[PDB]
Design a protein around this ligand. Structure first.
Ligand SMILES: [Cl-]
Ligand code: NA
Length: 353
C-alpha cells in the first residue's frame, strides 16, 4: 500500500525539492521514482539517496544500461548503489532477463508493465527471480490524448497480478508540471488535468494496483492538504462555492455518509428549516431538506448525479468543480468535510497548529 513521488535529476536538487520530499513523507508518501538520462549526475544521486535514507524512503531508478555504466556503476556490482540509498532499478536498455533475476534477490527490479511478455516472465521464473521483488511499472504520458484506457489498464493489471507481480502506476501532479508540454504526466488519460488526490486515492482502492506515484515534479499546496487531511483523519476534504444561504454554516464541517449509501446522493447521517432557494441540483449540489419534507426536514445531501428542482429541498451551495472527482470516492460510511472555497490550505494547517 504505497504512495510515491517523482524527482527529476536533470536539474540540481533545489531546497524547494528537499522541502517537498520531506513534506511528502510526512503526508504518507514512502517512495521516490526517478528517471535518468546521462549523455555530474553521480553526485546528484548520492545527494538524493542521502535524503531518502534519512527520510526512510525507497528509490526506484529508471536508467538505461549504458547510462548506468557511464555513471560509474555496474549492474553486477550493486553494493555501492545499495550503499547510496537506491532500492530499485528499472532497466530498459542492455540488461538481460537473467541479470535481472539474479539482481532481484538484492534489489527491487522495475519492469515495464506494457511490454513485459509471458515469455520474459517465464524466463525470470526459470532463473529463480524473487517475484516478491519485481515491480511492474506503467509509463506516463506527456502528450495529451496518449494515456491508456481503464479497460486495457484493468486487463493488464489483473494479468500482471495473476503472474505474481506488483503493479505501480502514476498520476499527474498539479504544482510544478514537467516540460516541454506541461500537460501533466498521467498514466490513465482520464486523469489528464484532474485532481491528483482524487486520482491517487481512486487508483489505490483498485484491488489490482499496489502503488501510486505523482508523475510530475510536485503537487500544489492545495492538493498536499487534501492528501494530508485524508492521511491524518481518514476524511475527504472538499471546497464549496460561496453562498448567501442561511444554511451554509449547517452544512460546513464534517459529515458521515450513511452506510446504506444512496445511488443518487451522499446523505449526511446526522431549528425549523424554512423554504429558501429550491433550484435544480446538478452534480455536486449541497442541499438541505426544508420543512415541506416533513420528517426529512434537515437532511443534508450532496448530489452524485444531476437531480431536478424539488420545492422541498433547499439548494445551499455546490462542490467546487475541481473537487467533484472526489465524490465517487466517498463510499458507504466514509467521512467528508466541506470547507469554503480557497481555505483548504489553512484548514490543513489548523490540524497541525
Ligand atoms: Cl477510460
Ligand atoms: Na489497491
Amino acid at each position: 500500500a504505497m504512495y510515491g513521488i517523482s524527482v527529476f535529476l536533470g536539474e540540481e536538487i533545489t531546497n524547494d525539492t528537499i522541502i517537498y520530499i520531506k513534506k511528502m513523507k510526512a503526508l504518507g508518501f514512502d517512495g521516490i521514482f526517478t528517471s535518468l538520462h546521462i549523455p555530474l549526475y553521480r553526485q546528484r544521486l548520492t545527494d538524493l539517496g542521502a535524503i531518502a535514507k534519512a527520510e526512510k524512503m525507497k528509490i526506484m531508478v529508471d536508467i538505461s544500461g549504458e547510462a548506468l555504466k557511464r555513471a560509474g556503476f555496474s549492474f553486477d556490482e550493486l553494493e555501492p548503489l545499495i550503499e547510496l540509498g537506491v532500492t530499485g532499478l528499472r532497466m530498459d536498455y542492455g540488461i538481460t532477463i537473467e541479470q535481472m533475476a539474479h539482481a532481484s534477490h538484492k534489489i527491487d527490479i522495475g519492469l515495464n508493465a506494457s511490454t513485459i511478455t509471458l515469455e520474459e516472465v517465464a524466463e525470470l521464473k526459470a532463473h529463480q527471480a524473487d517475484f516478491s521483488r519485481l515491480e511492474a511499472w506503467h509509463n506516463y504520458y506527456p502528450r495529451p490524448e496518449t494515456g491508456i484506457g481503464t479497460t486495457f489498464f484493468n486487463e493488464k493489471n489483473r494479468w500482471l497480478k495473476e503472474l505474481g507481480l506488483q503493479v505501480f502506476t502514476f498520476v499527474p501532479g498539479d504544482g510544478q508540471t514537467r516540460g516541454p508540454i506541461f500537460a501533466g504526466l498521467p498514466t490513465l488519460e482520464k486523469h489528464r488535468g484532474q485532481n491528483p488526490f482524487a486520482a491517487a486515492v481512486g487508483l489505490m482502492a483498485d484491488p489490482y494496483v499496489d502503488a501510486v506515484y505523482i508523475g510530475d515534479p510536485t503537487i500544489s499546496e492545495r492538493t498536499m492538504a487534501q492528501f494530508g487531511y485524508y492521511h491524518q483523519t481518514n476524511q475527504f476534504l472538499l471546497e464549496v462555492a460561496p453562498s448567501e444561504s442561511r444554511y451554509l454554516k449547517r452544512i460546513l464541517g464534517t459529515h458521515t455518509n450513511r452506510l446504506d449509501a444512496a445511488r443518487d446522493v451522499l446523505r449526511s447521517e446526522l431549528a425549523t428549516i424554512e423554504s429558501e432557494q429550491t433550484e435544480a441540483r446538478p452534480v455536486g449540489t449541497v442541499t438541505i431538506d426544508n420543512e415541506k419534507y416533513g420528517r426529512y426536514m434537515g437532511e443534508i445531501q450532496v448530489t452524485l448525479v444531476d437531480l431536478p428542482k424539488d420545492e422541498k429541498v433547499n439548494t445551499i451551495t455546490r462542490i467546487i468543480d475541481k473537487d467533484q472527482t472526489i465524490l465517487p470516492l466517498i463510499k458507504a460510511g466514509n467521512q467528508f468535510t466541506l470547507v469554503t472555497e480557497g481555505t483548504i490550505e489553512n484548514e490543513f494547517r489548523k490540524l497541525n497548529n
